[model samples]
Target chain A: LRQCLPCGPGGKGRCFGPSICCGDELGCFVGTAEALRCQEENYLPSPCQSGQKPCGSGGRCAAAGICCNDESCVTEPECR
Target chain B: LRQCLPCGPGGKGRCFGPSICCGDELGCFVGTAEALRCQEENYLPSPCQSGQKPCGSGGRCAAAGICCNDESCVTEPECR
Candidate 1:
């Protein structure tokens, strides 16, 4: 709820709870400032796992499973 | 004004002014039902001609110049 800060160098680091910044592979712990924990990202399942295919703002899938961009691999946030 | 009908055969034909159906290469004339005219489609100019590229509903041009679909070749009808 406060102003977020970079968790890593160059302000690109992951922001931890209150005011902790963790490196790419580390996370903040509830214990102390030195209480750094390993960050484990469990993917939310491939978009193809379900009948839904990765499409770029389209109800139809792109030809040959081509991804328009990195964000294309993710579901469209804003809808049409 | 009334229920629309197919202008071409198999209901794929283009509908003219009132109740006329023009063939693939012909257009409906302003004169009469028998007044059929050859259809000459003058393209409105290439989309790339105006610093604009053909894209799908995603508003992004796919890799190369490939069109996502037949309708993808045209501008997006709806917006996000």
Candidate 2:
């Protein structure tokens, strides 16, 4: 909150440090009203972390439930 | 969660290793789905992991910048 700027639906596009541009992207896709609520409550729209980097440098979504990186799920999966 | 699959603003990328950063937004955004896409995705509470990386790697939205190498995704943005 360096810039002390409150988050917007689309954010100011980047204020304090990295710039917060939220919009409940997946929320929209999932058809959930929580998306709007998130924004209203000043919550982040997109859930992309900074340090841990999930986008992977101009990274692109490649698989299902994957972070576009290079490994296996930290934990094991069960039979669905 | 019946196999949500996830959202990262975009990417079915990395798996384990630095898997902890999956959706720790600001910590790292792995927006696999929903405007409220959760980060540090599906994990434990005390939110933790290994390696002093990703943080030092946090980079810009370049071509696979974050995952390209050690000099990627640093806190300092290459900023367009």
Candidate 3:
């Protein structure tokens, strides 16, 4: 299974993919140039599919369907 | 930018998401239950969007358009 690594203040942040992270107040991004641009603007729309729900206010929905409170996603060490 | 972590034998493996890792001979997968199922079957299709290319054989295209050699995806610490 996919997992998230510790980040942000007090290790409370989450990853958006394998490279991007955001703090509790920010949403994670997909890490594409476009996605990064959107993150910079703080305007990334949820890419959730039909029947899937978007992440909470400051959370971003990762492609893995995990909700991360960072601007990017990454895998945990155990995942490796 | 999203980055990849060192894994597998001699750090040659890659992550599929935030919790799964695969070696060079394996393709990465999304971290959804469905994706894990697909990985188990070794039959995950590329989720590349229009104008995007699929990963090479034994490689999986992540949602960010990055190719991983694992069964899941995750973010790089630098992305945080």
Candidate 4:
């Protein structure tokens, strides 16, 4: 299985697969088409929450709750 | 943008976004959940074709016809 690091404010970080947690202050989004559709259709709520790190340049939230460089959330950059 | 190498028997190798081209001989699969669903529902045809490289251990086909270790296809190892 793929590994992921903890994120979000103390005790509130949760995500699945390769997604990363982003601070509620910053825009958080998943990279998958399904997730994108969910966002488009309002099926899912914003995954971002308080105390999480913001996605850096060339990065975004992916899979479970982790920052990733690409939408797929596989290529995690140090900036994340 | 992420980079990918050429694959397959020499022409007829095609894939999109981080996905690698696999030979018709070996099993080829994409890592995204959408692709997985399509695969499960038989909505999409097998992306594998002739003359492509098989995904190595800890590898899989990712966006745009490239071999990747992880399903997201970001962490491309030299083995690919």
Evaluated on CA atoms against the true complex, candidate 4 attains a DockQ of: 0.12
Winner of 1 and 4 under TM-score: 4
- Give the true-contact fraction for every prediction, in order: 0.00, 0.08, 0.10, 0.18
Candidate 2 has a DockQ of: 0.06
Candidate whose lDDT is highest: 3
**What is the fnat of model 1 with respect to the true interface contacts?**
0.00
Q: Candidate 3 lDDT, tens digit per residue, A1-80?
A: 32344333344444443335433333232342213322332343443222223455444444333454343233332212
Which structure among the candidates has the greatest DockQ? 4
The reply for model 4, stretches above 4 Å from the true place, is A1-59, A62-67, A70-72, A75-80, B1-33, B36-52, B55-57, B62-65, B75-80
Q: Please identify which of the two predictions, 2 or 4, would achieve the higher lDDT against the true structure.
A: 4
**Local lDDT at B14 for model 2:** 30
Residue-level lDDT of model 3, residues B1-80, one tens digit each, is 23344333344444453344343333222342223322322333443222223454444544333444343233333212
Error of 1 at B59 (Å): 49
Indicate whether candidate 1 or candidate 3 has the larger TM-score. Answer: 3
Model 1 residue runs over 4 Å out of place are: A1-3, A7-12, A34-80, B1-80
lDDT of 2 by residue, B1-80 (tens): 12323334454323222222222232233222331333333453343222223422342222222221211122223321
TM-score, model 1, chain B versus true chain B? 0.22
User: Per-prediction DockQ scores?
Assistant: 0.01, 0.06, 0.06, 0.12
lDDT of 3: 0.36
Better of 1 and 2 by lDDT: 2
Which CAPRI quality tier does the interface of model 4 achieve?
incorrect
